[PDB]
């Protein structure tokens, strides 16, 4: 049985490995999400997962793909630690408290609470990472920061500690939607496969269920994700509120804009989840048997 130290250390490393591997997908998602906000005279247009990544690598280099990565690693550490140390206690309070099974309701509430606390703790990392991923020298917007800690100090000094929590409520709602949609969709798909006997219950079945649920959650959260990215990236004063940003997006680009960066978002969710699962299991097994 993995101890807490090996679980916490394994979760941190698996999350960080998955993040460094799938970070170009996240950067491509952000670039696709902020593309139509401000018109650009440059002929550099982002279209697709590999199209966006290749355009970024050609016009800005490889290190521009991993811009804000230290912020992403900090977020991964805090989120993984909060999962390993808090999702356990709330879940076991809901299950063993009434001696009930981990029903979907208990799972929904546990994920909601853990995700909310994690979003609140890791919001400054999200602000810094999103602004660094979206900043570019080629579209007429002057980059505000040179790196993760430059961004940290500049945001803190010029706009307060509170300004490091900009976009918490969109991120919090997006977390709620991701969690609820993913859990409901996975249950519905797995019950369809197991009752209609469309597929046998082996890990291929759970993989199809999880992939379908991840895509459904990504599609369901895409409007909030686009609005959250644009709001977090915006400098002070551009948007009166988060509904203001959403309404401007709607009236100036339409319902399709709310799904900008949908393919990179879903690919990063799926690849991150599989990489973290594999790395986490292998790492905690080797640390426990070491």
């Amino acid at each position, epitope marked *: 049985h993995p101890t807490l130290g090996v679980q916490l250390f394994s979760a941190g490393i698996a999350a960080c490995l998955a993040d460094v591997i799938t970070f170009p997908l996240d950067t491509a998602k952000v670039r696709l999400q902020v593309q139509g906000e401000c018109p650009t005279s440059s002929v550099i247009r982002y279209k697709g997962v590999l199209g966006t990544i290749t355009a970024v690598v050609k016009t800005e280099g490889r290190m521009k793909l991993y811009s804000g990565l230290p912020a992403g690693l900090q977020r991964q550490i805090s989120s993984a630690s909060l999962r390993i140390g808090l999702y356990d206690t709330v879940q076991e309070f809901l299950t063993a408290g009434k001696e009930t099974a981990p029903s979907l309701g208990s799972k929904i509430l546990a994920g909601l609470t853990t995700g909310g606390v994690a979003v609140f703790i890791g919001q400054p990392t999200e602000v810094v990472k999103v602004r660094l991923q979206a900043q570019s020298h080629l579209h007429g917007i002057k980059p505000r920061y040179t790196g993760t800690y430059n961004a940290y100090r500049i945001i803190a000094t010029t706009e307060g500690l509170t300004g490091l929590w900009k976009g918490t409520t969109p991120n919090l709602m997006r977390s709620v939607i991701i969690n609820c949609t993913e859990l409901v969709t996975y249950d519905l798909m797995k019950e369809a496969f197991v009752k209609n006997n469309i597929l046998a219950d082996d890990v291929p079945c759970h993989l199809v269920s999880a992939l379908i649920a991840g895509f459904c959650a990504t599609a369901m959260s895409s409007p909030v994700d686009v609005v959250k990215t644009r709001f977090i990236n915006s400098p002070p004063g551009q948007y009166k509120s988060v509904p203001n940003c959403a*309404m*401007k997006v709607f*009236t*100036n680009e*339409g319902p399709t804009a709310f799904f900008k960066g949908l393919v990179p978002s879903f690919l990063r969710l799926g690849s991150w989840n599989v990489i973290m699962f594999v790395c986490f299991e292998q790492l905690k097994r080797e640390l426990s048997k070491s």
Partner: nanobody, 121 residues
Framework: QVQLVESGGGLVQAGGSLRLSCAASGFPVMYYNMHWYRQAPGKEREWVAAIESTGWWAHYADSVKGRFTISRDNAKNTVYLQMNSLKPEDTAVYYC??????????????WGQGTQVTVSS
């Protein structure tokens, strides 16, 4: 009932200045980017300038950048085009434009009637 009304055009000597105004009506202008186009006869309508919903960014055609400035006031529902060092090739009908995208496949263009700007040489 979208309605854009341009004004302020007229006959000006080359090198002179002119401020075009656009009174917008029938829609919440605080949410829409506003555009200035122009068209001279024998030519196609040329995009001139664009301004963000609250004036956060402004973009110009390369032919007018520096000479033309686009400006906004949402408390008066008005969009402004200041034109300086005017030159005879700027003689055209200038059009206020709203691209209302909304629940649509493509954006829908709402135009004004245009105001005529004639530059004498």
């Amino acid at each position: 009932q979208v309605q854009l009304v341009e004004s302020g055009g007229g006959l000006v000597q080359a090198g002179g200045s002119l401020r075009l105004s656009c009174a917008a009506s029938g829609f919440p202008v605080m949410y829409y980017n506003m555009h200035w186009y122009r068209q001279a006869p024998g030519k196609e309508r040329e995009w001139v300038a664009a301004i963000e919903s609250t004036g956060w960014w402004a973009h110009y055609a390369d032919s007018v950048k520096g000479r033309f400035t686009i400006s906004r006031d949402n408390a008066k529902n008005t969009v402004y085009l200041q034109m300086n060092s005017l030159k005879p090739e700027d003689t055209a009908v200038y059009y206020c434009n709203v691209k209302d995208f909304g629940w649509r496949w493509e954006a829908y263009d709402y135009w004004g009637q245009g105001t005529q700007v004639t530059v004498s040489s």
